[PDB]
Amino acid sequence: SVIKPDMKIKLRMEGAVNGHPFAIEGVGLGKPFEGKQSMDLKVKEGGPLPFAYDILTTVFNRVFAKYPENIVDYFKQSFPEGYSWERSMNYEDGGICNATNDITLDGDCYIYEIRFDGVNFPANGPVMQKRTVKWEPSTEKLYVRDGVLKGDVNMALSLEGGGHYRCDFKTTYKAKKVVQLPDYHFVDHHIEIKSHDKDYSNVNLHEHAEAHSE
Numbered sequence: 080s081v082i083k084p085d086m087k088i089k090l091r092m093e094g095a096v097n098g099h100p101f102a103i104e105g106v107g108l109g110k111p112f113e114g115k116q117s118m119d120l121k122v123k124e125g126g127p128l129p130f131a132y133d134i135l136t137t138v139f140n141r142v143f144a145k146y147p148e149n150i151v152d153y154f155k156q157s158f159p160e161g162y163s164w165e166r167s168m169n170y171e172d173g174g175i176c177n178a179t180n181d182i183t184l185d186g187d188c189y190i191y192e193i194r195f196d197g198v199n200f201p202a203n204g205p206v207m208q209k210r211t212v213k214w215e216p217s218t219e220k221l222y223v224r225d226g227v228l229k230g231d232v233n234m235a236l237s238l239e240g241g242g243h244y245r246c247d248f249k250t251t252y253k254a255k256k257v258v259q260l261p262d263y264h265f266v267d268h269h270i271e272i273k274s275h276d277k278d279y280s281n282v283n284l285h286e287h288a289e290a291h292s293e
């Protein structure tokens with residue numbers, strides 16, 4: 080046991096985009112072995128957010144990915160101690176976000192302490208003009224480096240005017256104890272904002288993920 084079929088999530092994120100700060104909290108649930116999850120998210124400070132919520136959504140846990148038995152699962156093995164990660168998100172227009180998640184487990188509920196910091200998004204660009212629609216589904220590429228796990232992914236935001244806005248994600252995953260390291264593999268993801276109020280003070284977010292290799 081320790082990884083149960085059904086588990087819960089609470090989180091807090093504190094952050095800032097272009098020096099304007101904000102914080103959001105949320106609760107949710109999901110199935111680790113099915114790679115599915117969902118959550119509700121409320122802006123507690125800095126609302127109404129003046130930039131595209133989509134930049135936050137991949138920051139709001141790779142335990143919720145379906146691993147087959149022939150690929151080692153760095154994430155499920157890491158609990159109950161858990162793990163953290165860091166990431167920079169490098170947008171084609173020179174906007175850059177750094178984020179971190181510290182993940183712990185209390186009973187059947189994961190707990191995330193998130194930091195998010197974005198800078199240099201142009202005023203006319205699609206993040207600050209809120210011209211984004213969704214992330215496309217993706218394939219993350221995961222490899223070992225210096226004893227820890229890396230995950231790189233080419234991501235794309237569909238723009239409401241048509242076309243896409245590209246971002247490169249480089250994530251380092253750090254387990255809090257010794258676990259077995261996997262060989263090169265992939266994680267397919269698909270993240271969707273399933274509902275939201277007008278200024279996104281409330282968001283319902285969904286993701287499903289599946290590992291594969293060879």
Ligand SMILES: [Co+2]
Nearest residue numbers: 216268269287
């Ligand atoms: Co899908």
Ligand SMILES: [Co+2]
Nearest residue numbers: 272274275276
């Ligand atoms: Co909408």
